[PDB]
Design a protein around this ligand. Sequence first.
Ligand SMILES: [Mg+2]
Ligand SMILES: [Zn+2]
Ligand SMILES: [Zn+2]
Lengths: 96, 62, 46, 42, 48, 116, 822, 470
Amino acid sequence: KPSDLHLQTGYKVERHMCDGDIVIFNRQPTLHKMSMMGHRVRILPWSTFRLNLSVTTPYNADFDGDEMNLHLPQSLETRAEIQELAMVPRMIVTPQ
Amino acid sequence: KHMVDDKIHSRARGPIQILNRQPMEGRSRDGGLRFGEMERDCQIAHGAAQFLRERLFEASDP
Amino acid sequence: QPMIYICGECHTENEIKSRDPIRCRECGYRIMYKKRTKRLVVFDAR
Amino acid sequence: YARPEWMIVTVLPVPPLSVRPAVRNQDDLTHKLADIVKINNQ
Amino acid sequence: SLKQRLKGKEGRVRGNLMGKRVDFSARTVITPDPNLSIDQVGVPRSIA
Amino acid sequence: ALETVPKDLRHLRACLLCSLVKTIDQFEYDGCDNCDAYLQMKGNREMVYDCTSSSFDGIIAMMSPEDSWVSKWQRVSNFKPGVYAVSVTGRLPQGIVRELKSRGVAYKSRDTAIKT
Amino acid sequence: PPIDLQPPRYLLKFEQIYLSKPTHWDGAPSPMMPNEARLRNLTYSAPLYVDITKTVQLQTQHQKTFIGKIPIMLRSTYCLLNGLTDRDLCELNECPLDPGGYFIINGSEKVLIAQEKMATNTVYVFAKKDSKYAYTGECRSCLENSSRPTSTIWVSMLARQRIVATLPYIKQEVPIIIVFRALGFVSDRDILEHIIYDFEDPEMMEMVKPSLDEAFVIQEQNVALNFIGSRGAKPGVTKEKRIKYAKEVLQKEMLPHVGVSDFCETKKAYFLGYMVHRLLLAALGRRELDDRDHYGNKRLDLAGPLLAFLFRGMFKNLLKEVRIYAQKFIDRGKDFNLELAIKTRIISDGLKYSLATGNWGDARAGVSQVLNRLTFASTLSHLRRLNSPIGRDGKLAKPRQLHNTLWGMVCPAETPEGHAVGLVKNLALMAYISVGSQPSPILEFLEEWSMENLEEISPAAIADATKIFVNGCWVGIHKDPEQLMNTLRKLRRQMDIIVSEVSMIRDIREREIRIYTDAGRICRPLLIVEKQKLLLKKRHIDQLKEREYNNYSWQDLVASGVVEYIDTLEEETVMLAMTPDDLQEKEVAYCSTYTHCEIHPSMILGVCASIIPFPDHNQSPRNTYQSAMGKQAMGVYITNFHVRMDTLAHVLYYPQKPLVTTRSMEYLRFRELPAGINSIVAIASYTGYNQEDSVIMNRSAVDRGFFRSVFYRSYKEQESKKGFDQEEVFEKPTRETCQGMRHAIYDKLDDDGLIAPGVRVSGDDVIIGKTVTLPENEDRRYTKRDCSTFLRTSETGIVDQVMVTLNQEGYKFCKIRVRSVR
Amino acid sequence: DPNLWTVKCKIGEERATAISLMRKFIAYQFTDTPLQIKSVVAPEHVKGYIYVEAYKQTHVKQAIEGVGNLRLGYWNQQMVPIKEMTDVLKVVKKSWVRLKRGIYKDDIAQVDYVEPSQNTISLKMIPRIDYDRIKAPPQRLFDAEKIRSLGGDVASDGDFLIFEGNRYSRKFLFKSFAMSAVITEGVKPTLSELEKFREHNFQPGDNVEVCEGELINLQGKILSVDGNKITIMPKHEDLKDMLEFPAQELRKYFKMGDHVKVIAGRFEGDTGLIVRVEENFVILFSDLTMHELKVLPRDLQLCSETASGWGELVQLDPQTVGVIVRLERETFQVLNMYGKVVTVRHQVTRKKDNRFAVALDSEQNNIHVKDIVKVIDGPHSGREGEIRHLFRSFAFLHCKKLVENGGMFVCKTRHLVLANELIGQTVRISQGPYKGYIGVVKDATESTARVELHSTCQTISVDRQRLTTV
RNA sequence: UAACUAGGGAACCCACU
Ligand SMILES: [Mg+2]
Ligand SMILES: [Zn+2]
Ligand SMILES: [Zn+2]
């Protein structure tokens, strides 16, 4: 009923994820720390994970039926943590 | 035979196993993905200990 | 109320009942095929 | 914390229903515990 | 047994405590796209 | 001989004197195969019901009592081979026991059970 | 053996068997067509009758007593559709394209994968370089048509130089000389005659001298057999019953292929002398060591030997149960009832379990796999698959590699590229596994000619003549090996006595000639080259083009002495021309001593590596990867796919034959049930969506039906009449009546709880309304619970067709095939 | 002396094995294959295996040859040890009985009439039957009218009756059964079986004194427990040693002002504090009520758990709800919205509770569940209770001080103060970009509706103004 | 005047990386 769809400050709303949300994207086998990195969501129509070309090389993912795993960070705190540690611009230069 | 509608699945707090309260296995029973040992090692390497707590405790079986 | 099934090898049709053993009347063939539905179908020709 | 006489199991802990489940259908651990309690009463 | 329930790679320590099934995760095929930045992944709508 | 051995499992009765286990047909037709001359239950059913038992525990197929330690513990070494009872519940009346003692046969009980 | 019971004795004997035609039933005997057995989840199995004869003596015979049902693979000689015309098959809803070769067990199509093994009855010399043994010989001895399994004897030289023997059922390392004395050969000179055939090479005698000087203490047969019986797996009581156990082990355990009889002492002695002699030649290096991966050293257990190995144990268990029943009903003094003696479940349910599950026993697994019906190429490639018995996850490479003797018998390219590279293989095209015949006509033919048997020779004329073996067992000597091999080949190029599959091998360097008649060897046909000319003349091509008129077949050409089957042992002694246009013309001559010519080199490839255009221009991992992918391509997998209720049927709208084809696709019938479409590709860098193994497709082409496929999925469900506590029944469940009813649409169902065909369903739509009763409906107002099968979630589509029938148990049983175009 | 050897046998067929071995001994006692064994023992209660008396194991193996029932002990034999051979032949040992076989196994039967022929006795039983209705079971009363209604094998003699396998009943089964088919020793029925037809309880942690002897008035905490002579080890006040006392010397003494529970009698289940300890009358007040409960000293124990003292919404009928105020054995005591405490059966329905429901008081303030409200009008005017359940116009109030009905009552809410159709219907999109598509409505709202399209592999949502049903 | 959750396991086989 529409009487309990009101919102005051302090409720949580588990909303469907939009553009600009942060996700963790990895490939088994996760060998090093650039095999599991943080991307920003873009909503595209068809039913695959369109990801960019230069991120193939840390993932070792050659698109011939490779499927990847996508984790969503649920708290806002871990969202900021992934944004400040595990972004793919912050994982360009490897320590190895 | 490997089509993408046969392989796509997502999951959010669906069915849960009875032996331990972890999510199911496989997309046929609406199960979730496994956050295995090597991903635990990789998130130690990132130092995302709050993300590692969120994966291994809160968003799996609190 | 009876359901019409097509009698497999016989290709004839017959009524069936609830809790009825599945047998044709022509030769007692055990495999029945249910007739195509009576509601409408519509296909986009794409 | 650890005493050598406590190693000899003179009373056996049977774990609860959260550990071995029931699904009508019993768990393998419940079958072995049935063997335990049957031979104990014998 | 209990020791066989705990000792395996499919056991409790490695199979359930170390690596466990997680909610909020998706798995589908990747296909390329050069028209989006290196930190963007294009997820489907029915996943989102 | 085979005449001592019971024919079936139904109505097995042990004697009160020597714990001989036979069927009621064999007590009716043969009496006691050890000491019927002292008891005389052949030709009388009521003498069998007075002189045999309806409650017994354990059987022993005593085949050679001359070289048996079980016959030494059950005191049946001087008897004939046959089917014997370990524990016998029952007792002869005082007339039969006094008549046996007048013939020099004191009645030792075969109730060797540990009653509590 | 005819089982005997001691009271008046009586024995039972089974003499003449009867194998009916597959028939189902309660019901009347009627011929069960195999598609009906597929649809009702029946088992396409023929009943098996035998006659009984008992003597109690007072004999009575009992003709045609029902032993039990054994499964039949389709297109056999005992299937219903043997030799039927294609019109008749299409009347039976069976396609003529289906090759058969699979069992129908509970509606499931099962394929017995051929299992490799080491070749039995054959002496091998290997080197355990890590153990205490320098060179170890072995002979996995197994007599043909013997219910007991193989029993490997080892004869091994110690590394330090004594020689010992590991016998079956004896746990200590028995010396060789002890065994030779235990066979009734007391002299050292006689044993040395049986071991070393020349007394003029003092080096080999000096090498056998320490092993001979180990056991000069034991001189008697009695003491020798006593030392045999000492440390047995069943140890001996005293001198008595241990002499007999050791005599039993030497009679019936080591070397059954040289015979199990009282007069077989000296034959067993000669063959053990051969084992020790070959071990001495290996310790000299005069003969090279033996390879475990040479495919002359292996056999292929097909469905014949596998079902025989299964039926040995299960027929023995049925005899054991008849003996238990007879032991019960003789001690009551009565007469047994023989129809209750033979219980049929132990001989039929065991076959059904070993074929349905694949757990090959009551042992190993994965023997009977479910047939792969995605593509006709995958169906053919699953019926021609060999499994190495070597287990997985091994870090070694030698059982996995492509050995040299895989030429022409097995495909070099096709192998599963996962953790079973090389272990699982796919047979080549023209290769054929020899089904084996009896050796007795060959032994009669050899005794007809001047072959001298072992029980009538001096041991002096052995080394100047050639030792002749049949199926491993050494049958005698012959003096003139040429004109014996010419005679045996002259009989095989005519099929007078010797079958075409049987193989002769003249070892020329070491004076041996061995004839194999085993069941499991792997041969392939080759042309025959006299002096430097093929025997395939123009008149054979003229009679062979005009088939269906002259009735001139392949078998007439085998009978003409033009082609013949060569197996892998005999390929070691053949000089094989590749192609005749190069290799019989005079040049700077390579050999000019060719014996056989390859028919066509493209017949070295498998069924999936035959559909590759120009596969010699590729790189070989690419050929292997295509051999994997060709089993996975969508296509019209069978012609009768509209009848079949397969789970996961992938068929295609407009499949095309390849414009670029091979000649060998004509014989796999790939142009009749193809898999894939000819497409105008371009190889271009473009917008950047064909980047890292991906391809850009044409949307307008796809809108014109390009690779638009259709995916069928069936769904089976039956109800279960049980002991009234839970009772499934198909009905449309009602919210007010049924409990636990999940929130979905139930008005799609018909009145019987099923979907009528032609109805759109989607994820978590119901397809089968089934309710199971609840025992506490009286123990209120809330009755039978929903037990319904939903449509599989995240799938959708139209219901193609629904069949309603009865199962094996007589319970109602529905299958629903749901169609979704892709 | 010979020794005893275990031979495994068929279960339940050990006496017949000894009979067959005795016949086999007598049948071959003059032949050239003699049984060299001495005796065969098959006891009364040892089930599964028998004993062979011999000097050798080989004599046992050559004597048991040809016996199939011992074939699982044929290959190997195990000797009974020398000290343990007397344990073989050692034997240990208007009323009520319990029947041995049948469906009435171990059921209490009152011995009505002992027939002096020593074959059977007449037994009064409670029938475990289903009255020929399920079979083509617990104990319940014999219903003669139900078995006259259902028919079958039934014969009526007023209250006397014969039924279903010659079962003899009257008013209650009265059927003859054998004395060897019942156990006439060791039944000991209970008080509920008397309606159908000393003791020591010391616990570890309880406090006890000593009433007699040289160690009198020594109060100590219980460590262990035994049956009759306990030899207890009590931790007394100001004594580091552990003394010894049996059960007849001790008594459950308790200091005034402690946790007490009652073990048995009328007062069981209830807890509290005792007040004044007399010679034997020990008076206490409960955790629930402040009523005086006077107990024997033996009927007290020391347990530090909180008392139990539940309160569900059940439907008396679909017009009036109820609230359970007492849980009983076969009934519920239920307080409805009317205020009428009723007693109804276990088989009322569970109504979905509305924990977010809103109500109005007498002063138009919003009130909810768990709200402490004062009653200013009505029959309960003056009390103050907590709202536990809600109705359209009624509210249930709990109060721990009010001892009636577990604290529950009801008041009207206006006397208080705070202190779809389209689902599964084939539609046709008649407007918009998807115009002309036939689908089935999966979900539907006031505004939009999700349509499973028959053509595409996709479920899309459109307005209800765009849909047109077939 | 809308009654709202899901249930097993163990083995083998195949496929993807
Ligand atoms: Mg890849
Ligand atoms: Zn018909
Ligand atoms: Zn007597």
